[PDB]
Write a protein that binds this ligand. Structure first.
Ligand code: S4M
Ligand code: S4M
Ligand code: 4K3
Ligand code: 4K3
Lengths: 273, 278
């Protein structure tokens, strides 16, 4: 049969993939979690959906994982302690762990079932979950950051007021925050709203980086990249990845794509000023 | 044979196991032309897509993201040339590239050849924002094979050739002036990276001095992006930095996707694809 994806907000279209083998399909305590192998004659491999929205495919998971992971960290002078909220597939953490500067990373994900299913059906994404520089919790990020002290983390990556206020609060003075931002084609209003809320919460700067992800609606998604410190230009890498030893293992991210990600179509450019 | 209230479904033989579909609100055209199947319909009015054109079952234009591809092709090429006075567009029957090229004050004449006169007719009726350029008298619009058209054209006729569709590419090189720019509808770095590598190498070997691939976000196309090979007949020219920035022309603010920053960023490729460009 077929997995069909559609959206009541964008009513008259759908996107479908052939299911070759259902590997998981159950409610969880927090969301519907579907994993299946897609057409072995196609490129998508294993696919994971949450409440019927594709979240991860074998084919392009590298895109969003490297952009969040390295755009943020390469914007920091020396990132040693890292929080990931959500990110339970482990992909971002894998990308975080490539950085030698990283001493420790906590990863907090509301949904234990996601990580378990990930270890089972996404080995190349989940390996990183048992790494000794990581600690993995099953819990609400909202609570977790409310119970975290000031000046704890150099980087907070949010891969899903008092929340945004807390995040600024837990970052050190050169803190860098990034999130999974939405689509400039479907959520532009909401991107504008967030950008400005995030800034009025007390972050010095907020800049939106666009990336190409084929399996997400409209072919792209972005991340808001936010600096606690004033005078920081996140759009030009602070510490290029080309000097670190893992650069040539990356399949999407480099310094030219860093810079380029912040050039927006004219209709959307007002997000970045 | 499509009917209002049903869904248009597209699949591909070549990438089995995916499908894409749009609800049809009203059929405005659905018949074979002497060249291809041409489908036009209004999509769901509670959605953003407006009117939609399909050729042989591949969507080609929607009201929605129309401007991306047309502006990228018109402007990346024209802003890479010192003085584009005479322009040829092969394909482009809908009028979209031509509306972008005609924005430019230096353009003195533009010929467009598209093999299917029906595409041009139905664009006149159903895409007024795209096709108004087609009646412009700085343009000459012929129905004809672009291949036979370039073959019958003398050397160094054009400053810029835009292909919106080996003996062909050599003709293209021949009909351009020493200063010429050619750009085309490239394919996708996700679906035909090998093809893009091959086209580029051989456009170079044909005799073009440089060829660089420009990536753009088009949400209605397979995998949500597509590209254009931007090729310079003369040596030592860098198409990846605007020769004549659009920001110095009167119409810069009318554009919805393209500007100089977008121009430079479009040549940055994800690492797996960057060898196309070096
Ligand atoms: C799958 S991941 C997105 C895929 C790209 N790596 C989205 C994760 O965020 C979690 N999530 C959602 N809400 C929360 C909260 N409130 N806290 C923590 N994690 C959360 C959710 O369980 C997904 O695993
Ligand atoms: C509609 S346009 C594609 C959408 C981008 N605006 C593609 C056009 O190329 C024409 N086409 C295809 N082959 C040729 C040749 N050989 N010559 C000229 N025009 C051609 C075809 O009729 C379409 O209208
Ligand atoms: O636009 C989308 C999906 C996300 S924007 N689908 C689509 C619409 C028209 C044509 C082809 C695809
Ligand atoms: O990946 C693709 C198409 C081209 S890259 N489609 C798709 C992705 C997710 C769900 C349904 C379809």
């Amino acid at each position: 049969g077929w997995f069909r994806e559609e959206n009541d907000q964008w009513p008259g279209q759908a996107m479908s993939l052939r299911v070759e083998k259902v590997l998981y399909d159950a409610p969880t305590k927090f969301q519907h979690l579907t994993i299946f192998e897609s057409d072995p004659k196609g490129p998508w491999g294993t696919v994971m959906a949450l409440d019927g929205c594709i979240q991860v495919t074998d084919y392009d998971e590298f895109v969003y994982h490297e952009v969040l992971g390295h755009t943020s960290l390469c914007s920091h002078p020396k990132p040693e302690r890292v929080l990931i909220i959500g990110g339970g597939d482990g992909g971002v953490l894998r990308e975080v762990l490539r950085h030698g500067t990283v001493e420790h990373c906590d990863l907090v994900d509301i949904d234990g079932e996601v990580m378990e299913q990930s270890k089972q059906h996404f080995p190349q994404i989940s390996r990183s979950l048992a790494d000794p520089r990581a600690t993995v919790r099953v819990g609400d990020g909202l609570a977790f950051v409310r119970q975290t002290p000031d000046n704890t983390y150099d980087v907070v990556i949010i891969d899903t007021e008092a929340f945004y206020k807390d995040v600024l609060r837990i970052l050190k003075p050169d803190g860098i925050c990034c999130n999974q931002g939405e689509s400039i084609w479907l959520d532009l209003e909401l991107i504008e709203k967030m950008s400005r809320f995030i800034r009025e919460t007390g972050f010095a700067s907020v800049q939106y980086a666009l990336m190409h992800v084929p399996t997400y609606p409209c072919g792209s998604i972005g991340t808001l990249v936010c600096s606690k410190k004033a005078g920081v230009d996140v759009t030009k890498p602070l510490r290029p990845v080309e000097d670190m030893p893992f650069a040539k293992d990356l399949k999407y991210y480099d310094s030219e794509m860093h810079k380029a990600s912040f050039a927006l179509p004219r209709f959307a450019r007002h997000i970045n000023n």
